[PDB]
Design a protein around this ligand. Structure first.
Ligand SMILES: Cc1cc2nc3c(=O)[nH]c(=O)nc-3n(C[C@H](O)[C@H](O)[C@H](O)COP(=O)(O)OP(=O)(O)OC[C@H]3O[C@@H](n4cnc5c(N)ncnc54)[C@H](O)[C@@H]3O)c2cc1C
Length: 373
């Protein structure tokens, strides 16, 4: 009884670690020819820190990442504080875990290192997947192939598993864009007094989220959401420039302007205008994360949902075993579709932490306390 996970992202590697720790025989196949530390920040709330606790990674992750005392929502133009969401020691006491902001590449690397060695394969690009009935044949672009009893679809937004299941999918134009940059140097130390640990700068049609990536506060990361022309480039990221960011964020608070001046290299990433409806499973194939329920990143919860899917899916396979995968896949959708729908409608309103609201329904969620029924 073997599980084949397609895709070694944050979601797939989390499923690999959790399912292997539960006793299952899991192998992962990643299309990237090598592993890359992404070189960006990521936010990890207490609800997912509890999943990292089950992997034995929470204590370690608390050592690298930055622990912001507050989430500040600030008006981009005036700098007025729209919300001051208490985290820090309050988050630990009220939600049972810490709210951390951390280097995504170092988290991604530590996650894959938690998988049993010799079971993660790079350069394995899935081209064809055939549900033979009793088993599934996976065909890779390098000519090699494998077989497993179930396949986990963790191939992200451009999931080949969703494609072979539902078809080519209609084209989605990219009308928005996301600038990203890591800031180190004396440019950070010169303005460190005005650089807050975790703050989102809002305006009328754009935003900039900024936070530190380590506990040492020696690295500062921002990620934006700006209207943009239709993305028709050969790559998933193009090099931006200070002139582009200055024009995009004209009128913003001097702190935001200082941030743009402090950069050395800025990359630009396209964002989809729309996403398809969730597809949880069909036959022996089961999906998680962006492959299952692609969403707008307005809530900074996508990867957290991918790991939550991995945790809930493991709880369901532990209850039924691979011999009864259909019941496991049904129990996994039934125990996740309401939470995923709630996150979907909040990113739809694009209002997450704009004003002073109670984030307990996200951070205080107990994935392991839920009854599967
Ligand atoms: C601007 C922005 C900011 C975000 N901020 C946050 C945040 O603060 N917090 C948060 O929790 N989430 C955040 N997210 C969401 C997060 O980036 C994604 O939701 C998350 O990466 C989804 O994980 P995944 O494993 O499902 O897919 P991915 O992370 O995309 O991983 C998929 C993997 O599968 C591989 N793959 C793809 N196709 C194949 C194939 N055919 N064969 C083999 N391998 C394949 C890919 O190479 C990749 O390694 C943000 C997203 C954006 C766009």
């Amino acid at each position: 009884q073997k599980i084949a996970i397609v895709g070694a992202g944050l979601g797939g590697a989390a499923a690999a670690t959790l399912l292997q720790q539960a006793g299952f025989d899991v192998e992962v196949f990643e299309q990237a020819p090598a592993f890359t530390r992404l070189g960006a920040g990521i936010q990890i709330g207490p609800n997912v820190m509890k999943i990292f606790r089950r992997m034995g990674l929470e204590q370690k992750l608390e050592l690298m990442g930055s622990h912001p005392d507050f989430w500040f929502s600030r008006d981009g133009n005036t700098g007025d504080y729209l919300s001051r969401i208490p985290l820090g020691e309050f988050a630990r006491r009220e939600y049972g875990a810490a709210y951390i902001t951390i280097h995504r590449g170092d988290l991604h690397a530590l996650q894959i290192e938690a998988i049993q060695p010799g079971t993660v394969h790079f350069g394995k690009r899935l081209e064809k997947i055939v549900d033979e009935g009793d088993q599934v044949r996976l065909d890779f672009a390098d000519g090699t192939h494998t077989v497993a009893d179930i396949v986990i679809g963790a191939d992200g937004i451009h999931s080949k598993i969703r494609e072979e299941l539902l078809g080519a999918e209609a084209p989605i134009y990219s009308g928005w864009v996301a600038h990203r940059a890591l800031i180190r140097g004396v440019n950070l130390a010169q303005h460190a007094d005005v650089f807050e640990p975790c703050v989102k700068w809002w305006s009328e049609d754009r935003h900039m989220m900024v936070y530190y990536t380590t506990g040492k506060r020696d690295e500062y990361y921002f990620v934006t959401g700006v209207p943009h022309e239709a993305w028709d480039f050969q790559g998933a990221f193009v090099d931006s420039s200070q002139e582009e960011m200055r024009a995009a964020f004209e009128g913003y608070h001097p702190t935001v302007q200082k941030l743009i001046d402090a950069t050395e290299s800025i990359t630009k990433w396209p964002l989809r205008n729309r996403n398809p409806l969730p597809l949880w499973s069909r036959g022996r194939l089961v999906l998680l994360g962006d492959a299952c329920h692609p969403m707008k990143p307005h809530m900074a919860q996508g990867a957290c949902m991918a790991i939550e899917d991995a945790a809930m899916l493991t709880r369901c396979l532990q209850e039924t075993g691979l011999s009864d995968h259909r019941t496991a896949f049904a129990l996994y959708e039934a125990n996740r579709k309401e939470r995923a729908s709630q996150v979907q409608s909040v990113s739809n309103a694009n209002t997450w932490l704009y004003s002073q609201e109670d984030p307990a329904w996200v951070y205080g969620y107990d994935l392991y306390g839920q009854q599967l029924e």
